[PDB]
Amino acid sequence: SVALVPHVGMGLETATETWMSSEGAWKHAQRIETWILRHPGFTIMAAILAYTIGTTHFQRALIFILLTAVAP
Amino acid sequence: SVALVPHVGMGLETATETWMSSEGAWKHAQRIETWILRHPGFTIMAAILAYTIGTTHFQRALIFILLTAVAP
Amino acid sequence: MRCIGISNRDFVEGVSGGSWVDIVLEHGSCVTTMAKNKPTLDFELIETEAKQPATLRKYCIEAKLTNTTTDSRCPTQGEPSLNEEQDKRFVCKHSMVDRGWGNGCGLFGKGGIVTCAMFTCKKNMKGKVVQPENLEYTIVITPHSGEEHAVGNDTGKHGKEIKITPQSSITEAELTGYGTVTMECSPRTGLDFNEMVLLQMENKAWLVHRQWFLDLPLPWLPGADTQGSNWIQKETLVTFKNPHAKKQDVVVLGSQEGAMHTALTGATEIQMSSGNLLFTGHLKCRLRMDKLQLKGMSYSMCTGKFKVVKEIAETQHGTIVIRVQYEGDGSPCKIPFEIMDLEKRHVLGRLITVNPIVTEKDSPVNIEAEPPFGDSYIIIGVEPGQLKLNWFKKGSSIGQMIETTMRGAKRMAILGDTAWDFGSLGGVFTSIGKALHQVFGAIYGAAFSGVSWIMKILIGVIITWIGMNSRSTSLSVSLVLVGVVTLYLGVMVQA
Amino acid sequence: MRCIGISNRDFVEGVSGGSWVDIVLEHGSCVTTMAKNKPTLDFELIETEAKQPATLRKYCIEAKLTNTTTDSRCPTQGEPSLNEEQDKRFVCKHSMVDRGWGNGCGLFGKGGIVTCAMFTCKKNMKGKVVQPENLEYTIVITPHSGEEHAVGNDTGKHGKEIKITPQSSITEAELTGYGTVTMECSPRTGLDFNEMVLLQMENKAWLVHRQWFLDLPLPWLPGADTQGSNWIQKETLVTFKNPHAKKQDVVVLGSQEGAMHTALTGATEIQMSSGNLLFTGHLKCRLRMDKLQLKGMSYSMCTGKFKVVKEIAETQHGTIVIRVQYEGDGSPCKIPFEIMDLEKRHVLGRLITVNPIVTEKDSPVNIEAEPPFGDSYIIIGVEPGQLKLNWFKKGSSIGQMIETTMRGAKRMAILGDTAWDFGSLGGVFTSIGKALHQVFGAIYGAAFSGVSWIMKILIGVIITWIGMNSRSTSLSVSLVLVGVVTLYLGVMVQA
Numbered sequence A, B: 001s002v003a004l005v006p007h008v009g010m011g012l013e014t015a016t017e018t019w020m021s022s023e024g025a026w027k028h029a030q031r032i033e034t035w036i037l038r039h040p041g042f043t044i045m046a047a048i049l050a051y052t053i054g055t056t057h058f059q060r061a062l063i064f065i066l067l068t069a070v071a072p
Numbered sequence C, D: 001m002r003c004i005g006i007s008n009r010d011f012v013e014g015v016s017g018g019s020w021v022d023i024v025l026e027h028g029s030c031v032t033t034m035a036k037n038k039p040t041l042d043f044e045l046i047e048t049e050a051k052q053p054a055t056l057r058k059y060c061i062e063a064k065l066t067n068t069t070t071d072s073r074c075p076t077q078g079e080p081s082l083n084e085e086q087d088k089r090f091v092c093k094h095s096m097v098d099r100g101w102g103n104g105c106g107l108f109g110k111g112g113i114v115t116c117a118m119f120t121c122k123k124n125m126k127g128k129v130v131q132p133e134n135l136e137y138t139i140v141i142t143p144h145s146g147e148e149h150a151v152g153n154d155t156g157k158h159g160k161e162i163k164i165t166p167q168s169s170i171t172e173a174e175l176t177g178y179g180t181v182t183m184e185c186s187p188r189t190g191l192d193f194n195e196m197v198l199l200q201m202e203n204k205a206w207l208v209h210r211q212w213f214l215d216l217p218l219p220w221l222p223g224a225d226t227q228g229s230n231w232i233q234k235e236t237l238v239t240f241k242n243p244h245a246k247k248q249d250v251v252v253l254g255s256q257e258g259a260m261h262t263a264l265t266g267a268t269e270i271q272m273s274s275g276n277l278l279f280t281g282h283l284k285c286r287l288r289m290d291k292l293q294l295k296g297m298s299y300s301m302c303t304g305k306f307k308v309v310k311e312i313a314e315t316q317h318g319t320i321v322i323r324v325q326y327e328g329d330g331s332p333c334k335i336p337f338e339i340m341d342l343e344k345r346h347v348l349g350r351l352i353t354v355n356p357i358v359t360e361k362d363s364p365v366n367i368e369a370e371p372p373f374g375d376s377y378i379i380i381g382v383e384p385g386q387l388k389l390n391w392f393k394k395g396s397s398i399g400q401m402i403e404t405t406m407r408g409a410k411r412m413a414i415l416g417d418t419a420w421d422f423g424s425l426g427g428v429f430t431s432i433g434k435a436l437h438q439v440f441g442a443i444y445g446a447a448f449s450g451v452s453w454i455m456k457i458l459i460g461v462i463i464t465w466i467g468m469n470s471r472s473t474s475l476s477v478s479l480v481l482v483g484v485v486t487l488y489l490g491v492m493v494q495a
Ligand SMILES: *[C@@H]1O[C@H](CO)[C@@H](O[C@@H]2O[C@H](CO)[C@@H](O)[C@H](O)[C@H]2NC(C)=O)[C@H](O)[C@H]1NC(C)=O
Pocket: C148, C149, C150, C151, C152, C153, C154, C155, C156, D102, D103
């Protein structure tokens, strides 16, 4: 709600700082981290399904990083 | 904040309905949709990078659905 | 009683190994048990109180700023500073404005300037924990026989309410006329507190996972507030926006009520107002039989005149609960009851009340049977066979074995481990069954926890595939691994 | 003036094609322009007002429920209903409770029951749109010469403030003693409203993309509230929780203030309080020269006694702004000024103020030069050469061509299209340059909009790779496509 689908890259970027300097921008990733750190269990899982699904090294790397960020 | 990392699957599932019947559960996807619908531009992009990155059909399908949900 | 028509439900035909009944109950559940003797019982636990907890943390959600001042010092010579930063009761920020020559400063180029505000919180919420010692569950069990009290009288007095706290162990239940049922609750492995975090909130509350509760952003306090306001953070809220260059000031960033709510979207509701009695729990225990005899078994199986008062319902394949009303032949006595097969005697109807017994030549009792699948006859009363009521169900054998397969499966994939505690007695099966699902459960299926249900099933699929088009035997295990277990939890879960 | 020491900045040496200067200005920017004549100018626009807008929508964020009633009807025979549902001013929900036989109902099994509440909103926020007609920009341009007013006097009177509304087109700027600078603002292609949604909020506001504004959840109103409360929705907030089976009631789900804020995290701040003057804008226009003559060019290049009053700063490679203080030889006249090379005359210092001119035998004027890279001498004053001030910069040629490459590149990848409007006059280059980046920009790079910056660069990478290990020529184009453009926008963007 006023929690998600937060007017971000709609497209009115303007030379002068917006509403959340960069705190918001950085924060986001900052929290996946907190999370992933929390349940290595899933990091584990993910990377695995990775290792097998795909094959093209880069492939793996890719779906991996995703799955990670996919689950908030 | 009290916007994200919302006590979900911590693990106290209990025979009796929780705090958001299912409205929340369904809602989530309901909004990616609203979004993807909004900017087919990205659906476009995604699926493409897809078509090329990977190759193993299922592969494609996979990183695609992801990228989609990856970008809120 | 106390269960007739409650959706959630379940029976347990069997006493086994001398009184060893193994049951699990969770509020909207009421477990009912039958035996080759003993007036079967309807078990339902309700009020599960907690007492003497402690406030562990205290996030606030309606911050408000005041007194706000701001100093600047000029290009290089001085990361600006002032008194206010001293009273940690404030908030501050060292930033760079372009203090230029004309600005009325030094030798332009760029400089420092900090902003500071005294930070008062306006309505925090407060967490709370409860030592399992002081987790008083209330268990209300009861007979049948029926009466004016009837079904789900709830608000009355039948079976009494034997309250039990792990601050004790086994409790006797003095049941009028019958004897004393003995229960061995294991209130110490049910909900599993001090893993749980009781959390009030502007007047409403939520039981919530300890971790998450010690991470959700916001400005927090400690446990011993009592005039403190030295809120570790504030940085979570209040923000001083710095447009393009100059100025640079602070702002509240508004309340957080609803936000909070929406965030908290997985915890169960609860209470806090009225000595916080957190429902939703689910404890298990050994229901110990014996010394639990049925009432009649003495006075004749009396014959006479009797009408009925209501037809028959059936929520849950077989709940034939019939109202009758004896008369004439007086004095409180038994009742001739059979669930026979259309005319040609060959009776085959499960009895659940194990003989009623009239008692007031008025008292319109009510029996409770589980008639067979097709059509059935409830012949109630001898002599001129005074009454035979034809009925018919739909106990369609197979439709049964299935809805059970599931409903049961459910009770499994909700409680986990203890699911097996529903099967009174071990012997390799239920005993080792638990022993395995115990760890194989707490592991994989339960070691990839915290992911939203959606993602959950997503992994189900990606895995069923990484399985399905496998390569020699191992797949079957891979599939199953996928199928049910996950794929299913998902298509289910999300309480 | 008005710019000396403002970080954001930029010059434009060139009048071209007879007065054709092409400039773009955005609040914290002030564009300064020089010519082979004409007292170069410092352009800075500020207050950009809007007037007579309209309230298009009105989401509320502090909902509150009252009067709440609830009816039930019983198994099958009647999807329950009552009067209250009539007054859409309420909220309702048809749900299934297990109304059983004892419940004091019908023939148990399951049944219907609805909940309803009169829904009063408590503090909405209200959007708002502004027809571009009524978008009064204020442009404040000014000379130099200096004085007590000095640099960035801001709060005074110099160059005046020529206000311009597209409710007109070109505006004359009567500049004291100099003449009349003529500007052709294109306030109709700058910010691009009626694409934008002005949005107040409990007293603070945000300019925000129309779409998003017509999607954010919440209970909304229309435009013509005036005692209405027939809030389309309410379903966004208020929720009636139904625990396990029975009961089933409604709740507020709390305010939304801060939530709102946090959600709105991409829009720029603004105003609403004080005739909503939305800064942050950035309009372009043709600055039209001619009829803009320098002051002196008449009175002698006077000689005499003169001290100085301040050393010299330099924010932005070359901003040598020096304070002097003539005396003795009286009567308001010129000033001998050179930026010569250490002793051995071969002068080579860019002048920015184009000759000062004393005026009060007191008036400590101040010049503004751009000394070369190494060490430079500012010889100011003839006769006994009364004064030569040795200085030295760091105008390190290459360090220059680079910081420009970027800073410029930036002004490009912020404004887009109109970036080219910074280069006065076309001729294939800047003219067609725009013509191309115009569409190639509005397309790809601008047709995959709305994705958070993070994801943005992520695609940069995945693409640089799908590129990099390409296959014959096409890659180079693929790489570039990646590099800069995206990869860069990302490493930049997020205003
Ligand atoms: C619940 O139990 C109460 C307790 O008996 C029942 O209430 C009685 O109702 C009769 C009928 O009028 C009264 O004459 C009694 O005085 C009531 N008892 C008292 C003193 O409360 C009630 O009918 C039962 N209802 C159910 C099935 O929940």
